[PDB]
Design a protein around this ligand. Sequence first.
Ligand SMILES: [Mg+2]
Ligand SMILES: [Mg+2]
Ligand SMILES: [Mg+2]
Ligand SMILES: [Mg+2]
Ligand SMILES: [Mg+2]
Ligand SMILES: [Mg+2]
Ligand SMILES: [Mg+2]
Ligand SMILES: [Mg+2]
Ligand SMILES: [Mg+2]
Ligand SMILES: [Mg+2]
Ligand SMILES: [Mg+2]
Ligand SMILES: [Mg+2]
Ligand SMILES: [Mg+2]
Ligand SMILES: [Mg+2]
Ligand SMILES: [Mg+2]
Ligand SMILES: [Mg+2]
Ligand SMILES: [Mg+2]
Ligand SMILES: [Mg+2]
Ligand SMILES: [Mg+2]
Ligand SMILES: [Mg+2]
Ligand SMILES: [Mg+2]
Ligand SMILES: [Mg+2]
Ligand SMILES: [Mg+2]
Ligand SMILES: [Mg+2]
Ligand SMILES: [Mg+2]
Lengths: 91, 97, 76, 252, 135, 112
Amino acid sequence: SKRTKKVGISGKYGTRYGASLRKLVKKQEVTQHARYTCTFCGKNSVRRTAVGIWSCKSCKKTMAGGAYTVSTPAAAAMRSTLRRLREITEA
Amino acid sequence: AQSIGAKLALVIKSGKVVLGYRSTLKALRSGKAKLILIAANTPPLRKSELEYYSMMSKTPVHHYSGTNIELGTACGKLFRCSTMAILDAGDSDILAD
Amino acid sequence: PQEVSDIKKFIEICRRKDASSARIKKNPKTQQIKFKVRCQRFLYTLVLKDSDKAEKLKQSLPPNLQIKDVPKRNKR
Amino acid sequence: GRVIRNQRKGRGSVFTAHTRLRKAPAKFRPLDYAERHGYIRGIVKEIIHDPGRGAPLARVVFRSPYKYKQITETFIANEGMYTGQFIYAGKNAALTVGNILPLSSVPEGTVVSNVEEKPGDRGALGRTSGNYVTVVGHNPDEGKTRIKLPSGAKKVVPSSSRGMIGIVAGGGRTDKPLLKASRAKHKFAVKRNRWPKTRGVAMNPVDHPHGGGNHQHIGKASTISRYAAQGQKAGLIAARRTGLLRGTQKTK
Amino acid sequence: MKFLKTSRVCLVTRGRYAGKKVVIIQPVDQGTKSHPYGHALVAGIERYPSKITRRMSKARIEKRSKIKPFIKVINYNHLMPTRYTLELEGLKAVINADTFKEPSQREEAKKTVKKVLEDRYNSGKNRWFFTPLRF
Amino acid sequence: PTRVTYRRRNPYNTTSNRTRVIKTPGGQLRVLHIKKRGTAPKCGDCGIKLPGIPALRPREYATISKPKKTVQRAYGGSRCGNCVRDRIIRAFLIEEQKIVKKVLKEQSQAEK
RNA sequence: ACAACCAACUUAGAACUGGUACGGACAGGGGGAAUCUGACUGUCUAAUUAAAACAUAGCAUU
RNA sequence: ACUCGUGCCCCGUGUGGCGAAAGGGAAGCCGGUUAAUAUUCCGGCACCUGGAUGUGGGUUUUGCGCGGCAACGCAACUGAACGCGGAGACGACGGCGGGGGCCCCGGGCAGAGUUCUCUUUUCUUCUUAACGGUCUAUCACCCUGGAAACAGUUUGUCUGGAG
Ligand SMILES: [Mg+2]
Ligand SMILES: [Mg+2]
Ligand SMILES: [Mg+2]
Ligand SMILES: [Mg+2]
Ligand SMILES: [Mg+2]
Ligand SMILES: [Mg+2]
Ligand SMILES: [Mg+2]
Ligand SMILES: [Mg+2]
Ligand SMILES: [Mg+2]
Ligand SMILES: [Mg+2]
Ligand SMILES: [Mg+2]
Ligand SMILES: [Mg+2]
Ligand SMILES: [Mg+2]
Ligand SMILES: [Mg+2]
Ligand SMILES: [Mg+2]
Ligand SMILES: [Mg+2]
Ligand SMILES: [Mg+2]
Ligand SMILES: [Mg+2]
Ligand SMILES: [Mg+2]
Ligand SMILES: [Mg+2]
Ligand SMILES: [Mg+2]
Ligand SMILES: [Mg+2]
Ligand SMILES: [Mg+2]
Ligand SMILES: [Mg+2]
Ligand SMILES: [Mg+2]
């Protein structure tokens, strides 16, 4: 079944706070409650514990991530840039 | 290399392999392992242990660039595989290089 | 309170210097005889199912330490 | 008139920051011989949530160069750091995320966190979630380094100042609406007694410069001079301009 | 190729002797009725000789250079084989899977192993075997 | 279904005023004040419960014997055994790698 | 595949019946069409004002 | 370390107090007893802390236990400094499972109520403490083994070649 047309996870808020605010909250809530594959062990068991803290239930590893996503695009771009600018210094 | 996937598919189709850490260690101990594959995201301690076992067995090691998910998919399974051993390479030439 | 499994350990306990007194509790409804010896820390109870061994244990016990028979309806 | 709320806040009392659930301040290691000349290796034991702080903190254990003990430090966690990770702090440390390096040994264009204003101060700049300091340039003869701050300002710090390679974890925390008075209350209940806030125009003249009147109105220009007396500084202090920002701003 | 044979030096990774170094006396690659798995009869050191210095007297040195051995049946999965090896002729057939059935045989085998290991230790050879592992 | 009372001057349910209900040989229902539950010691590496050690209040461990407080192997208490095996294997591998690295550096950088 | 033994309640269907009555006391929403106003939950003049006032999230400025 | 207190030798980064009769925390239960106290008195049966030295037991005599593949076990089974770790030690809410007590039902025992008529009837009692011994009790962990025709599995979920 579907149980809902568009409100999705944001249906717990009823008719309150306004549609635009409900959509904005839903956008972050979906990613913040989603499950993620562990980079270290490969299991789909990484979940958010605190605002910027993501832990794997299987391999028990904890990593520092984004507020509502495990990795932010800024950090990914910074990692790529760091690798490039470090390799051009090393060799 | 990219050809490792085709070689692995041929080896599984024709020869025989063991998938998993315990079976790989058993093969290395018994000396019937011809080559071992270790996934990139294998834990460092386990990877070093497997490398030491293969040094003892004089068995070649290939460091598969993919994760355990990708290694299992290459082996044609629906589960992950952190490490595996090839006990018999058949029509494939995986042991040539 | 502690249960003593066998007659040898019970009599060895009764030989102890700190053994103060002993008493036989007869439960006819269960046909049971309990030998209880009061030491310093614990009260030791040995359970017997027959009267022959009870009488032989009573006669083989040390004679210095006093023995009672637990009268029915002990007074305050 | 009365002493206004902004004046009362500086007395302390009920406006003191809450500290029970905060375990330790987030600081670098003290600048020592190992960090000055080579590098030192530390192990990340845990990534913890610090109440009142958006960014997570990292507990990192180091060995004492001079004693058999071991020392646990509390760093601001950079995003990508994980438990069981080796981090390296020193002049000769590798240029990887989580390593603490002096700005002199860092190329131009890299971002760092918890940058020291002066070497040995154990971190002052760019220590909030999603924030960082960019290494704009170097002046080796002067022994200094130009950096760009989160606010957009340009600063010059001695090249010996240290920073942690990467971006502070905690991502886009302010990307989701609080949506609820309770959530604002929970946010501030571990920081300070500053919520809720009553508007000055809703007060009486005894309570605030914006005072009373038969309509809720300020009644005089809300921009207040930089050198106004204490008790007068309510509104927009030393405002260069007001109104909606309708374009790019020359200042940065 | 086989590397788990007699003389092969290994480390025990489980049990009371975890972290202790052993030398294989007899590998049993196929299981027996008991222990139906690849295992090995091994002899090892329980109490390593203490550190000795150039300043101690010979009596103190000889009292400190004492080894308490042990004899074990151990699963292969509870061993870590090492590149090191120890061919001692005195330990050729000290234990034969029947010494473990009688405590007196265990004591006699331990005495023999103790004597052989002490002789080898004061020979000055295979110092890695007699140096305790730090972990 | 007789009702019960606290047997101490503390009238509040303060996580230290734990009680359970008993029936006495006198035939009446009563309260027994009980202490907090014992807690199993955890591994210092992985944090799981350690098998073979009783869960007691901290002061209670001072009156039971050592073999009941520990298990007979290296890091008997405070480590779980799997962590001990990992430590052993890791230590051996790091020393082996260090030895081969020093020999390689001596053979390939000091050969002249 | 039936028989025997054990065990509570929950639901559904039918006949008959009386005072056409049955949530028989108790318990227990009046509803609808609109206008002004504050978005909502919340708070205040203890002892004449509970509100459209305050707060709020959101927005903007310094 | 001396007949005798006072002779030295090591470690050092720290170096106060008050503040909870609901926070943390060593240890006591039952029966009886007074006009009025009782987990305090009496009887029985226990526990903790501290200090002392005994008997037995264990271990060893160039030395500090033994067993189990293992998870670990056993009545002990040396251990300074220095260090590491655990416990103390922690939110709110939801459904599920185990246990105690209470409630309810059936039978029996003893007493009481009703009994023109009926009711194998209605009601009450039938108890078992701390402290111990012994055998068990989910989760977890170990060994064998190697899973796709994927399997196991909760009300819900989830778990597995990292087995
Ligand atoms: Mg004034
Ligand atoms: Mg306001
Ligand atoms: Mg007003
Ligand atoms: Mg004024
Ligand atoms: Mg003015
Ligand atoms: Mg207005
Ligand atoms: Mg006007
Ligand atoms: Mg009706
Ligand atoms: Mg109503
Ligand atoms: Mg309103
Ligand atoms: Mg108020
Ligand atoms: Mg009023
Ligand atoms: Mg008034
Ligand atoms: Mg009123
Ligand atoms: Mg005090
Ligand atoms: Mg208290
Ligand atoms: Mg008393
Ligand atoms: Mg008394
Ligand atoms: Mg004592
Ligand atoms: Mg003795
Ligand atoms: Mg507390
Ligand atoms: Mg009971
Ligand atoms: Mg009821
Ligand atoms: Mg009944
Ligand atoms: Mg009982």
